[PDB]
Design an enzyme around this catalytic site. Structure first.
Site, PDB file in Angstrom:
ATOM      1  N   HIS A  89      -4.456  70.483 -20.224  1.00 41.23           N
ATOM      2  CA  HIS A  89      -5.042  69.266 -20.732  1.00 41.23           C
ATOM      3  C   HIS A  89      -6.242  69.603 -21.638  1.00 41.23           C
ATOM      4  O   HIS A  89      -6.499  68.863 -22.607  1.00 41.23           O
ATOM      5  CB  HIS A  89      -5.516  68.316 -19.605  1.00 41.23           C
TER       6      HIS A  89
ATOM      7  N   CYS B 192      -6.302  74.673  -6.061  1.00 41.03           N
ATOM      8  CA  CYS B 192      -6.053  73.434  -6.716  1.00 41.03           C
ATOM      9  C   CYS B 192      -4.698  72.765  -6.369  1.00 41.03           C
ATOM     10  O   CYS B 192      -4.735  71.805  -5.599  1.00 41.03           O
ATOM     11  CB  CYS B 192      -6.156  73.470  -8.224  1.00 41.03           C
TER      12      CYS B 192
ATOM     13  N   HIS C 146      -9.370  77.226 -13.143  1.00 36.37           N
ATOM     14  CA  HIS C 146     -10.040  76.687 -11.955  1.00 36.37           C
ATOM     15  C   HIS C 146      -9.249  76.812 -10.666  1.00 36.37           C
ATOM     16  O   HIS C 146      -9.795  76.405  -9.621  1.00 36.37           O
ATOM     17  CB  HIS C 146     -10.322  75.180 -12.159  1.00 36.37           C
TER      18      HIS C 146
ATOM     19  N   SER D 298      -3.972  70.714 -15.603  1.00 37.49           N
ATOM     20  CA  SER D 298      -5.260  70.296 -16.134  1.00 37.49           C
ATOM     21  C   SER D 298      -5.867  71.345 -17.039  1.00 37.49           C
ATOM     22  O   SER D 298      -6.628  70.943 -17.948  1.00 37.49           O
ATOM     23  CB  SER D 298      -6.221  69.994 -14.967  1.00 37.49           C
TER      24      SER D 298
ATOM     25  N   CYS E 227      -2.615  75.566 -14.023  1.00 37.38           N
ATOM     26  CA  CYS E 227      -2.524  74.176 -13.656  1.00 37.38           C
ATOM     27  C   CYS E 227      -2.389  73.310 -14.940  1.00 37.38           C
ATOM     28  O   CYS E 227      -2.978  73.651 -15.949  1.00 37.38           O
ATOM     29  CB  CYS E 227      -3.739  73.772 -12.807  1.00 37.38           C
TER      30      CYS E 227
END
Ligand SMILES: NC(=O)c1ccc[n+]([C@@H]2O[C@H](COP(=O)([O-])OP(=O)(O)OC[C@H]3O[C@@H](n4cnc5c(N)ncnc54)[C@H](O)[C@@H]3O)[C@@H](O)[C@H]2O)c1
Ligand SMILES: NC(=O)c1ccc[n+]([C@@H]2O[C@H](COP(=O)([O-])OP(=O)(O)OC[C@H]3O[C@@H](n4cnc5c(N)ncnc54)[C@H](O)[C@@H]3O)[C@@H](O)[C@H]2O)c1
Ligand SMILES: C[C@H](CCC(=O)O)[C@H]1CC[C@H]2[C@@H]3[C@H](O)C[C@@H]4C[C@H](O)CC[C@]4(C)[C@H]3C[C@H](O)[C@]12C
Ligand SMILES: C[C@H](CCC(=O)O)[C@H]1CC[C@H]2[C@@H]3[C@H](O)C[C@@H]4C[C@H](O)CC[C@]4(C)[C@H]3C[C@H](O)[C@]12C
Ligand SMILES: [Zn+2]
Ligand SMILES: [Zn+2]
Ligand SMILES: [Zn+2]
Ligand SMILES: [Zn+2]
EC number: 1.1.1.1
Lengths: 373, 373
Positions: free
Chosen positions: B51, B173, B67, B48, B46
């Site tokens: 990030h 997610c 996650h 994120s 993902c």
């Protein structure tokens, strides 16, 4: 009678920002097709009219301001069918044409024919007022600080002939805006906790709507502690003055509500309180509504993480009400004693004392001053 | 056999920002009370997780990120009752304790027990991972870029035993977030016009939700035109690249929609596109949802009159879904062919090639890369 003729009457003309209104004679033209000429009976002083005098709102000058009012139709132009001479009416500062896509939407109320700040005229682009031989601009299509005004038909609603115009002129702005902001825009729920920033006429009307919606807790917020007693009278369960605390008010409200409020309302017009009202609502399911008019040419700065967690932020004009459909219903509800307007009226003055009414608002001494023509 | 004992396995540890992940041997402690140790089977990459590497998100280092994943329970700690060894499960990056104010609220999904960025531990404030003589931080309570992870029970959902874990890890997610953003947070209506900024895995899921909701127009917006074919495959009716226009994107979308879209979604993570997405929605009734994660410690600047006219601005995490309740249902919906996940999977790699998976994402060539353990 006066039908079909230019009327010479008294009006409050604003020729320059930050100066007193000039109470003097104006010439009001007769109504053109689809227009209505109204003899005003009562007008309220709203903080947005003061925003035109302070420069918070920029409107073309010279202008006849005023947008919260009620009167009696004196004459109608060709094609008018929704009102007649002799009917009591309330000018609508946001029109309801009934045919545009916003008027047809179940929730929108900002009719695409609205005449906002830059458009200081009637719908046809011209003015019906002259003063000292000079054309004067209209405001919000209503221009109610005049013994007579001319409005487009989509900007006027007929109301109950038995209503007291010195009270129901507040349905033209203050009361409806605050009440609708709670019951229609935020849709406050039974048993919730609400925070209302600003305890003027509109903020008190938000408290009335939160109490009518069954909120269990209503926290009023104002830097003028003299506004608290009336706020409690109309529903606040507690009042807090931000200047009495060492921490920012959003932190105080979050602690008080054990984690953030269900609904918050900014009813002042300041960027920092708009951000604080958003922050004080619960981060995952809180709802914050902006009712106050922000200062011209200023951007708000905020951390987008306040929205990412789940908060809803929204604004609204006139409490979300579709104006021509709602104003007559609100006056009938008032006649049926479904709500009260006397709590918002603190002062009554003749129209000629309009400047004294504006100084009462600016000094913090009044809620709504009603001017009688 | 491994129950009650430390497990030595491989995990992808991030020791420093802007550096590659290190595949290293780590020690994974056995689960304490109300904890579940899971053998990972598949994990999605993902934006994120990227990030954390780039510094857009600040997480205590060293850390085991990850996650979006699915696995099989290896052992359970004392008191666990919702899963058993051998069950297929999806770790929940937002927990569902069932007891806090948000969990009891009908719309809210950010459970107060959530472990966000600054909280690099299990619910008890400690770590289950050791590497090179040092404890390693957890990430979002899940840390799925490890052959074995330990998650609190309020962070794990049991799913259908016949589920294809290499596909349903996306319900952990990307898919769920984008789809829910449209059907549960914005509540897209049939016949509406939607604008989706960002056409990665989450933006494509937003398009899938808008199509499922019956939108009449779904406008995909991305500066990488190589993302347009897949966006149209999943439902976009048109795609626009901001670089092709002289005007700002919000003005282009306002013109295309003859006055503003009904629903807009920011699924990128930039402050300017968050403000553009709000501006392109219809001023009296548009709704804009922020899904992208903005850069750390940076505020956005905007004109509050965008909200006063009637717009609604909101953000949401994980599509507004309450996680433990919703993940098993979404997997059952996938098994019943209610939605598709293959369109989002462009690449498959072994876990050992995690860095290549991140390089694919950063190069602009992939949507979701699924890692197999
Ligand atoms: N959205 C709309 O349709 C609409 C309609 C009516 C009025 N308005 C706007 O709503 C606002 C309220 O109007 P009103 O007529 O009730 O005004 P008002 O002046 O009577 O009330 C404002 C209240 O805010 C309080 N206040 C000022 N600064 C403050 C601060 N820093 N912190 C806490 N409290 C503070 C003042 O003490 C006061 O009691 C104004 O900005 C007005 O322009 C918007
Ligand atoms: N709210 C949540 O629960 C949640 C969950 C998942 C992801 N996210 C966030 O959602 C965002 C999207 O995640 P993803 O995995 O789909 O990422 P992604 O990188 O695959 O997709 C982002 C897309 O945005 C496009 N883009 C970049 N700059 C742009 C610009 N100026 N204009 C138009 N398009 C532009 C890229 O080309 C790319 O296709 C990320 O910020 C991520 O952190 C939030
Ligand atoms: C309704 C209100 C004045 C009445 C009152 O506040 O009491 C006026 C003052 C400022 C006006 C706003 C500003 O002129 C800025 C916007 C201009 C757009 O053309 C319409 C929405 C827009 C957001 C306006 C809507 C409405 O006309 C406002 C909000
Ligand atoms: C859920 C998401 C990570 C997973 C994903 O983006 O793919 C993470 C990244 C940044 C996190 C946000 C930031 O840490 C900022 C906020 C911190 C608060 O304590 C909770 C809300 C808050 C707004 C966080 C919610 C959630 O944990 C976020 C939004
Ligand atoms: Zn007003
Ligand atoms: Zn209309
Ligand atoms: Zn909870
Ligand atoms: Zn994610």
């Amino acid at each position: 009678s006066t039908a079909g003729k230019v009327i010479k009457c008294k009006a409050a003309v604003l020729w320059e920002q930050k100066k007193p209104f000039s109470i003097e004679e104006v010439e009001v033209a007769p109504p053109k097709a689809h227009e209505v000429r109204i003899k005003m009976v009562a007008a309220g002083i709203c903080r947005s009219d003061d925003h035109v005098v302070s420069g918070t709102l920029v409107a073309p000058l010279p202008v006849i301001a005023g947008h919260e009012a009620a009167g009696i139709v004196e004459s109608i132009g060709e094609g008018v069918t929704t009102v007649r001479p002799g009917d009591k009416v309330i000018p609508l500062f946001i029109p309801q044409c009934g045919k545009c896509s916003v008027c047809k939407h179940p929730e929108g109320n900002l009719c695409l024919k609205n005449l906002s700040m830059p458009r200081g005229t009637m719908q046809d682009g011209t003015s019906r007022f002259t003063c000292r031989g000079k054309p004067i601009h209209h405001f919000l299509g209503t221009s109610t600080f005049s013994q007579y005004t001319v409005v487009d038909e989509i900007s006027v609603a007929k109301i109950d002939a038995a209503s007291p115009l010195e009270k129901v002129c507040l349905v033209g702005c203050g009361f409806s805006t605050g009440y609708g902001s709670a019951v229609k825009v935020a849709k406050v729920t039974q048993g919730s906790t609400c925070a209302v920033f600003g305890l003027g006429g509109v903020g008190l009307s938000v408290i009335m709507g939160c109490k009518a919606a069954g909120a269990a807790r209503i926290i009023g917020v104002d830097i003028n502690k003299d506004k608290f007693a009336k706020a409690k009278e109309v529903g606040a369960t507690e009042c807090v003055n931000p200047q009495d605390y060492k921490k920012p008010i959003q932190e105080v409200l979050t602690e008080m509500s054990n984690g953030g409020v269900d609904f918050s309302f900014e009813v002042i017009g300041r960027l920092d309180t708009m951000v604080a009202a958003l922050s004080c609502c619960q981060e995952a399911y809180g709802v914050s509504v902006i009712v106050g008019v922000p200062p011209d040419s200023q951007n708000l700065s905020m951390n987008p993480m306040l929205l990412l967690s789940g908060r809803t932020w929204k604004g609204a004009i006139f409490g979300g009400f579709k104006s021509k459909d709602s104003v007559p219903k609100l006056v009938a509800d008032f006649m049926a004693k479904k709500f009260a307007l006397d709590p918002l009226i603190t002062h009554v003055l003749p129209f000629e004392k309009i400047n004294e009414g504006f100084d009462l608002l600016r000094s913090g001494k009044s809620i709504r001053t009603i001017l009688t023509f």
